[PDB]
Design a binder for this molecule. Sequence first.
Ligand SMILES: *[C@@H]1O[C@H](CO)[C@@H](O[C@@H]2O[C@H](CO)[C@@H](O[C@@H]3O[C@H](CO[C@H]4O[C@H](CO)[C@@H](O)[C@H](O[C@H]5O[C@H](CO)[C@@H](O)[C@H](O)[C@@H]5O)[C@@H]4O)[C@@H](O)[C@H](O[C@H]4O[C@H](CO)[C@@H](O)[C@H](O)[C@@H]4O[C@H]4O[C@H](CO)[C@@H](O)[C@H](O)[C@@H]4O)[C@@H]3O)[C@H](O)[C@H]2NC(C)=O)[C@H](O)[C@H]1NC(C)=O
Ligand SMILES: *[C@@H]1O[C@H](CO)[C@@H](O[C@@H]2O[C@H](CO)[C@@H](O[C@@H]3O[C@H](CO)[C@@H](O)[C@H](O)[C@@H]3O)[C@H](O)[C@H]2NC(C)=O)[C@H](O)[C@H]1NC(C)=O
Ligand SMILES: *[C@@H]1O[C@H](CO)[C@@H](O[C@@H]2O[C@H](CO)[C@@H](O[C@@H]3O[C@H](CO)[C@@H](O)[C@H](O)[C@@H]3O)[C@H](O)[C@H]2NC(C)=O)[C@H](O)[C@H]1NC(C)=O
Ligand SMILES: *[C@@H]1O[C@H](CO)[C@@H](O[C@@H]2O[C@H](CO)[C@@H](O[C@@H]3O[C@H](CO)[C@@H](O)[C@H](O)[C@@H]3O)[C@H](O)[C@H]2NC(C)=O)[C@H](O)[C@H]1NC(C)=O
Ligand SMILES: *[C@@H]1O[C@H](CO)[C@@H](O[C@@H]2O[C@H](CO)[C@@H](O[C@@H]3O[C@H](CO)[C@@H](O)[C@H](O)[C@@H]3O)[C@H](O)[C@H]2NC(C)=O)[C@H](O)[C@H]1NC(C)=O
Ligand SMILES: *[C@@H]1O[C@H](CO)[C@@H](O[C@@H]2O[C@H](CO)[C@@H](O[C@@H]3O[C@H](CO)[C@@H](O)[C@H](O)[C@@H]3O)[C@H](O)[C@H]2NC(C)=O)[C@H](O)[C@H]1NC(C)=O
Ligand SMILES: *[C@@H]1O[C@H](CO)[C@@H](O[C@@H]2O[C@H](CO)[C@@H](O[C@@H]3O[C@H](CO)[C@@H](O)[C@H](O)[C@@H]3O)[C@H](O)[C@H]2NC(C)=O)[C@H](O)[C@H]1NC(C)=O
Ligand SMILES: *[C@@H]1O[C@H](CO)[C@@H](O[C@@H]2O[C@H](CO)[C@@H](O[C@@H]3O[C@H](CO)[C@@H](O)[C@H](O)[C@@H]3O)[C@H](O)[C@H]2NC(C)=O)[C@H](O)[C@H]1NC(C)=O
Ligand SMILES: *[C@@H]1O[C@H](CO)[C@@H](O[C@@H]2O[C@H](CO)[C@@H](O[C@@H]3O[C@H](CO)[C@@H](O)[C@H](O)[C@@H]3O)[C@H](O)[C@H]2NC(C)=O)[C@H](O)[C@H]1NC(C)=O
Ligand SMILES: *[C@@H]1O[C@H](CO)[C@@H](O[C@@H]2O[C@H](CO)[C@@H](O)[C@H](O)[C@H]2NC(C)=O)[C@H](O)[C@H]1NC(C)=O
Ligand SMILES: *[C@@H]1O[C@H](CO)[C@@H](O[C@@H]2O[C@H](CO)[C@@H](O)[C@H](O)[C@H]2NC(C)=O)[C@H](O)[C@H]1NC(C)=O
Ligand SMILES: *[C@@H]1O[C@H](CO)[C@@H](O[C@@H]2O[C@H](CO)[C@@H](O)[C@H](O)[C@H]2NC(C)=O)[C@H](O)[C@H]1NC(C)=O
Ligand SMILES: *[C@@H]1O[C@H](CO)[C@@H](O[C@@H]2O[C@H](CO)[C@@H](O)[C@H](O)[C@H]2NC(C)=O)[C@H](O)[C@H]1NC(C)=O
Ligand SMILES: *[C@@H]1O[C@H](CO)[C@@H](O[C@@H]2O[C@H](CO)[C@@H](O)[C@H](O)[C@H]2NC(C)=O)[C@H](O)[C@H]1NC(C)=O
Ligand SMILES: *[C@@H]1O[C@H](CO)[C@@H](O[C@@H]2O[C@H](CO)[C@@H](O)[C@H](O)[C@H]2NC(C)=O)[C@H](O)[C@H]1NC(C)=O
Ligand SMILES: *[C@@H]1O[C@H](CO)[C@@H](O[C@@H]2O[C@H](CO)[C@@H](O)[C@H](O)[C@H]2NC(C)=O)[C@H](O)[C@H]1NC(C)=O
Ligand SMILES: *[C@@H]1O[C@H](CO)[C@@H](O)[C@H](O)[C@H]1NC(C)=O
Ligand SMILES: *[C@@H]1O[C@H](CO)[C@@H](O)[C@H](O)[C@H]1NC(C)=O
Ligand SMILES: *[C@@H]1O[C@H](CO)[C@@H](O)[C@H](O)[C@H]1NC(C)=O
Lengths: 43, 438, 132
Amino acid sequence: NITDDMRGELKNCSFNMTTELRDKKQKVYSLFYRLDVVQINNK
Amino acid sequence: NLWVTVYYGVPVWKDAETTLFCASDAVWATHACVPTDPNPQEIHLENVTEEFNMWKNNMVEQMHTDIISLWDQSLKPCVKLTPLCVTLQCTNVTNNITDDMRGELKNCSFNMTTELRDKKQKVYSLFYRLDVVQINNKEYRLINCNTSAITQACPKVSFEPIPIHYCAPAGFAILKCKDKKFNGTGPCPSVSTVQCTHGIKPVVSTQLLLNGSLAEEEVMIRSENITNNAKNILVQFNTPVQINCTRPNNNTRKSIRIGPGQAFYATGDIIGDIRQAHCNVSKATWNETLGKVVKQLRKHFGNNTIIRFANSSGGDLEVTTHSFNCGGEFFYCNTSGLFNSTWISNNDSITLPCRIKQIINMWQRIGQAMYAPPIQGVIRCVSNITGLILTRDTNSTTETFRPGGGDMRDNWRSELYKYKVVKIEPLGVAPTRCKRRV
Amino acid sequence: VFLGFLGAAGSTMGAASMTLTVQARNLLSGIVQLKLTVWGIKQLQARVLAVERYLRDQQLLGIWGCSGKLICCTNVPWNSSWSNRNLSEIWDNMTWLQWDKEISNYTQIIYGLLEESQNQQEKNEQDLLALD
Ligand SMILES: *[C@@H]1O[C@H](CO)[C@@H](O[C@@H]2O[C@H](CO)[C@@H](O[C@@H]3O[C@H](CO[C@H]4O[C@H](CO)[C@@H](O)[C@H](O[C@H]5O[C@H](CO)[C@@H](O)[C@H](O)[C@@H]5O)[C@@H]4O)[C@@H](O)[C@H](O[C@H]4O[C@H](CO)[C@@H](O)[C@H](O)[C@@H]4O[C@H]4O[C@H](CO)[C@@H](O)[C@H](O)[C@@H]4O)[C@@H]3O)[C@H](O)[C@H]2NC(C)=O)[C@H](O)[C@H]1NC(C)=O
Ligand SMILES: *[C@@H]1O[C@H](CO)[C@@H](O[C@@H]2O[C@H](CO)[C@@H](O[C@@H]3O[C@H](CO)[C@@H](O)[C@H](O)[C@@H]3O)[C@H](O)[C@H]2NC(C)=O)[C@H](O)[C@H]1NC(C)=O
Ligand SMILES: *[C@@H]1O[C@H](CO)[C@@H](O[C@@H]2O[C@H](CO)[C@@H](O[C@@H]3O[C@H](CO)[C@@H](O)[C@H](O)[C@@H]3O)[C@H](O)[C@H]2NC(C)=O)[C@H](O)[C@H]1NC(C)=O
Ligand SMILES: *[C@@H]1O[C@H](CO)[C@@H](O[C@@H]2O[C@H](CO)[C@@H](O[C@@H]3O[C@H](CO)[C@@H](O)[C@H](O)[C@@H]3O)[C@H](O)[C@H]2NC(C)=O)[C@H](O)[C@H]1NC(C)=O
Ligand SMILES: *[C@@H]1O[C@H](CO)[C@@H](O[C@@H]2O[C@H](CO)[C@@H](O[C@@H]3O[C@H](CO)[C@@H](O)[C@H](O)[C@@H]3O)[C@H](O)[C@H]2NC(C)=O)[C@H](O)[C@H]1NC(C)=O
Ligand SMILES: *[C@@H]1O[C@H](CO)[C@@H](O[C@@H]2O[C@H](CO)[C@@H](O[C@@H]3O[C@H](CO)[C@@H](O)[C@H](O)[C@@H]3O)[C@H](O)[C@H]2NC(C)=O)[C@H](O)[C@H]1NC(C)=O
Ligand SMILES: *[C@@H]1O[C@H](CO)[C@@H](O[C@@H]2O[C@H](CO)[C@@H](O[C@@H]3O[C@H](CO)[C@@H](O)[C@H](O)[C@@H]3O)[C@H](O)[C@H]2NC(C)=O)[C@H](O)[C@H]1NC(C)=O
Ligand SMILES: *[C@@H]1O[C@H](CO)[C@@H](O[C@@H]2O[C@H](CO)[C@@H](O[C@@H]3O[C@H](CO)[C@@H](O)[C@H](O)[C@@H]3O)[C@H](O)[C@H]2NC(C)=O)[C@H](O)[C@H]1NC(C)=O
Ligand SMILES: *[C@@H]1O[C@H](CO)[C@@H](O[C@@H]2O[C@H](CO)[C@@H](O[C@@H]3O[C@H](CO)[C@@H](O)[C@H](O)[C@@H]3O)[C@H](O)[C@H]2NC(C)=O)[C@H](O)[C@H]1NC(C)=O
Ligand SMILES: *[C@@H]1O[C@H](CO)[C@@H](O[C@@H]2O[C@H](CO)[C@@H](O)[C@H](O)[C@H]2NC(C)=O)[C@H](O)[C@H]1NC(C)=O
Ligand SMILES: *[C@@H]1O[C@H](CO)[C@@H](O[C@@H]2O[C@H](CO)[C@@H](O)[C@H](O)[C@H]2NC(C)=O)[C@H](O)[C@H]1NC(C)=O
Ligand SMILES: *[C@@H]1O[C@H](CO)[C@@H](O[C@@H]2O[C@H](CO)[C@@H](O)[C@H](O)[C@H]2NC(C)=O)[C@H](O)[C@H]1NC(C)=O
Ligand SMILES: *[C@@H]1O[C@H](CO)[C@@H](O[C@@H]2O[C@H](CO)[C@@H](O)[C@H](O)[C@H]2NC(C)=O)[C@H](O)[C@H]1NC(C)=O
Ligand SMILES: *[C@@H]1O[C@H](CO)[C@@H](O[C@@H]2O[C@H](CO)[C@@H](O)[C@H](O)[C@H]2NC(C)=O)[C@H](O)[C@H]1NC(C)=O
Ligand SMILES: *[C@@H]1O[C@H](CO)[C@@H](O[C@@H]2O[C@H](CO)[C@@H](O)[C@H](O)[C@H]2NC(C)=O)[C@H](O)[C@H]1NC(C)=O
Ligand SMILES: *[C@@H]1O[C@H](CO)[C@@H](O[C@@H]2O[C@H](CO)[C@@H](O)[C@H](O)[C@H]2NC(C)=O)[C@H](O)[C@H]1NC(C)=O
Ligand SMILES: *[C@@H]1O[C@H](CO)[C@@H](O)[C@H](O)[C@H]1NC(C)=O
Ligand SMILES: *[C@@H]1O[C@H](CO)[C@@H](O)[C@H](O)[C@H]1NC(C)=O
Ligand SMILES: *[C@@H]1O[C@H](CO)[C@@H](O)[C@H](O)[C@H]1NC(C)=O
């Protein structure tokens, strides 16, 4: 909700994930807390 | 006057559950087990009578879970087939034209990961259409992959049922009635006792009971509640009914090194007498025995009722058909050819069509599955049908009965009803004319 | 005459008392003779429970000054409320199982006096006889 009181704290992350069909992968997403994830080196 | 006198070694006991342990001779899962005595002892007990109750006999419960535990332990050290879950490219197999075999297997191929984690290898294997399912040549999938992982049973370990004896620890007694009559519960005029039980083979089967013990006198009908059709009926035979089942396929085992290190046994080629696997039953024998069963039924329903036999209600193949293991292979047979008759108011041989599966689920347990390796060469065997698992189906004459199963505790109970475990209490007191001096 | 384990179970309490040892031996029995594994801790547990099962009551006989067991007398009189029958109505016309059927009602009650009375009084007394 604009502007920004929550400070986000979570990111709308997406990634090519291996599924039950070890072979063809699936682009999925999930909300993670920035306390759990860290920038490597959208980003 | 009488005084309190203390006695020890008193021949009394209370019904109680403890931890039983095995014994058997000197394959399946048994090695870590105490050898039996060369002279198993017993003793008929005269004037001793009491009640049995097979429906609350917790010996069954222990045996059941113990067998399950054994099963798992025998699989853990074996090869997991996790990387088999891939898209399969499959096609019909042109059996001798036109088509009597209905195929039933597909010539599936797929890019498989090998020992060289890197460069893959296009391989193939013959699978039963009971094991695979179409995704969405065409694409297919191993049915287990939507439910759980699957593990290959070791090629060395077998599944041959071995006679197991059960023993109670000191202070507990194994009681055994010798009364040829038994309703399933109540007092037994003739009770004996034994060190340990007789050898019981852990035979897993549905509908039909195989290689069990025989009943004396007449056919035995046992049920928790005959009048309650939410229950079921155990039928024990007097005479072994031979059944001879065959798989006429001299097939090979194109084992594929889908390592690293660990090896997988795929299905090679199928050659020989391309006929559907089936069972042979002596028809007159079946008719004769069935009649003897109906006599009993007459005796608990009336001298003016009609008895009909039919197949199951359908549904899950595991319950619908007769499942059993022969030599590691798992058979599913259409017992409609047996359970199709009737009786009024007061060679020949039967061929039973069977199917083969390679992916199976034990004891109704979901969350895991086991892959049977194909057994090389023609597989044929013979066994004794020793009882029925029947269920009871406008209720003033005609009643219909049908085969069931599912809960394999039923199988163990069909044998262990002859046994019960009690806890001895050595210490007792009684009034005796005696005043003790210093 | 050797009958066998529990061979006198189907007889009167008087008769059964003849061969209490034949039973006594197998109350503890003895002998019997990839890790864990089914049975791996079951034979363990069971064989343990046998030992405990035995000694738990054996100690009571240790407390109830007898030790030389199977049979011994006390200095506790029998209360008539505890199934008032005659000796011939009891010992010559009743099995041990039938006996327990009734007397089991007063088990702990009787144990009270067995656990105590004599054990308390037999002693002190002796200590006093040792005065000279
Ligand atoms: C209801 O109960 C009945 C009665 O118990 C059961 O019927 C039995 O079922 C089992 C299978 O579950 C049958 O076992 C098979 O026995 C075969 C016969 O072997 C005997 O003859 C051969 C041939 O000359 C001798 O060499 C053998 O002698 C040797 O072995 C014994 C025992 O180990 C030793 O004591 C001797 O010293 C000898 O060393 C026997 O006398 C037997 O060939 C067969 O074994 C093959 O198949 C098994 C898998 O089932 C393989 O693991 C094993 O490697 C064998 O395979 C080799 O040989 C075949 C032969 O063609 C080749 O094709 C293979 O490539 C490979 O080289 C198996 O053990 C038993 O016959 C049968 N008994 C009766 C009474 O008929 C029922 O199963 C039961 N019902 C149910 C529902 O289970
Ligand atoms: C998984 O998601 C990643 C992004 O997180 C996808 O990455 C894309 O991968 C392809 C193949 O490496 C890249 O395509 C190539 O890009 C170059 C330059 O644009 C072009 O010259 C080639 O012809 C080719 O298209 C693509 O750029 C890359 N995307 C990004 C953001 O780097 C990948 O496609 C995803 N997989 C699934 C199955 O969707
Ligand atoms: C978080 O990222 C996810 C992707 O990882 C974004 O998913 C997108 O979510 C919206 C809402 O569910 C989807 O939009 C809907 O799509 C259907 C079909 O295209 C259309 O009919 C609707 O009108 C609507 O647009 C969108 O398709 C979905 N994207 C994908 C890849 O599935 C989500 O938007 C992200 N959130 C943030 C704040 O950016
Ligand atoms: C594993 O087997 C699969 C088939 O089950 C093989 O799939 C083939 O994969 C390649 C690469 O994705 C596809 O090639 C590409 O096809 C397009 C259109 O034909 C063409 O534009 C590209 O230049 C390229 O050739 C090929 O079509 C696909 N085959 C099918 C049936 O979909 C894969 O090659 C196998 N791997 C091994 C090592 O053999
Ligand atoms: C089942 O599918 C497999 C492939 O997954 C098919 O394998 C083919 O089997 C034949 C017989 O073993 C092979 O043919 C022989 O090949 C050699 C060399 O090319 C040639 O010298 C012989 O004259 C003969 O054609 C064939 O190469 C092999 N294919 C591959 C990929 O290895 C098999 O045909 C399939 N069965 C069904 C009914 O379609
Ligand atoms: C054997 O099991 C059967 C069923 O499991 C028991 O049958 C039950 O018998 C009673 C007495 O006839 C029935 O109760 C009566 O039902 C009517 C209607 O619900 C109600 O109006 C009465 O007040 C009374 O409860 C009961 O319905 C019947 N159950 C069924 C399935 O028909 C029988 O009692 C069992 N025998 C043993 C020894 O437990
Ligand atoms: C046991 O044998 C009986 C026949 O004695 C088989 O009965 C068949 O049962 C199914 C399920 O109730 C019936 O299928 C249903 O039929 C209706 C109408 O045809 C159709 O609308 C449904 O889609 C469904 O197919 C079938 O008609 C019935 N057959 C007859 C003769 O009544 C049962 O299948 C047998 N079980 C085994 C395992 O083979
Ligand atoms: C077990 O074997 C029996 C034969 O011994 C098979 O019986 C077949 O059962 C089905 C279902 O009841 C019958 O199919 C129905 O037939 C009617 C008329 O043909 C048709 O209108 C329906 O659409 C349906 O197909 C079939 O006729 C019956 N066969 C005979 C000989 O009566 C049963 O299929 C077998 N089960 C297994 C799993 O193979
Ligand atoms: C099992 O219970 C039966 C009764 O149901 C007991 O029967 C008793 O058996 C003995 C031995 O055969 C009989 O004793 C003999 O009797 C004759 C005449 O009284 C006497 O001359 C002999 O010296 C001897 O005592 C006894 O009479 C018989 N009782 C009756 C009611 O017939 C048997 O003792 C029981 N076994 C157990 C272990 O308690
Ligand atoms: C494999 O052979 C089977 C018959 O053995 C074919 O089955 C047909 O499959 C389609 C799709 O399910 C149905 O429309 C037909 O009715 C099926 N026929 C029958 C006899 O049931 C299948 O088409 C064959 N595949 C190949 C590639 O020819
Ligand atoms: C897991 O796959 C099985 C098939 O392997 C699916 O089973 C189907 O389930 C529905 C609902 O019970 C039935 O209509 C079908 O007949 C079942 N198929 C068969 C082969 O029995 C199940 O839906 C799958 N689960 C997932 C989440 O897709
Ligand atoms: C086991 O036999 C006993 C009799 O020995 C049966 O007991 C009957 O049980 C029903 C239900 O409680 C009562 O209506 C009868 O009066 C009981 N009979 C007597 C003698 O008490 C019991 O039905 C039998 N079980 C089997 C499966 O037949
Ligand atoms: C089928 O059960 C019968 C019992 O009805 C078993 O019969 C034994 O057969 C052998 C061979 O003829 C004899 O040595 C035994 O003495 C028979 N027993 C009796 C009770 O007569 C036969 O072994 C059984 N088959 C299976 C595979 O267990
Ligand atoms: C059903 O009728 C038969 C006779 O047709 C009855 O048979 C009797 O059964 C008992 C128990 O086995 C025996 O004591 C009799 O001797 C049998 N009679 C004869 C003629 O053999 C049976 O009693 C009948 N059942 C009903 C409920 O009346
Ligand atoms: C059930 O078994 C009966 C025989 O006990 C089968 O009867 C056949 O039924 C068909 C249809 O009425 C007739 O064409 C045959 O001549 C009957 N046979 C005889 C011996 O009379 C019937 O087919 C069986 N059903 C199942 C599903 O197999
Ligand atoms: C024998 O034990 C009984 C209890 O088992 C004693 O019963 C008491 O008897 C007196 C006289 O009738 C009553 O005043 C008490 O209330 C009874 N007690 C109970 C528990 O009912 C009796 O005293 C005992 N005799 C001996 C000698 O101690
Ligand atoms: C089984 O035999 C009985 C007579 O014992 C008869 O009534 C019935 O028809 C027979 N069944 C077969 C298939 O012949
Ligand atoms: C005790 O037995 C005598 C006979 O010995 C009898 O007269 C009396 O009735 C018996 N006791 C009981 C409670 O009846
Ligand atoms: C023992 O007393 C209990 C109630 O405390 C009773 O249920 C049982 O019938 C009694 N036994 C005797 C022999 O009276």
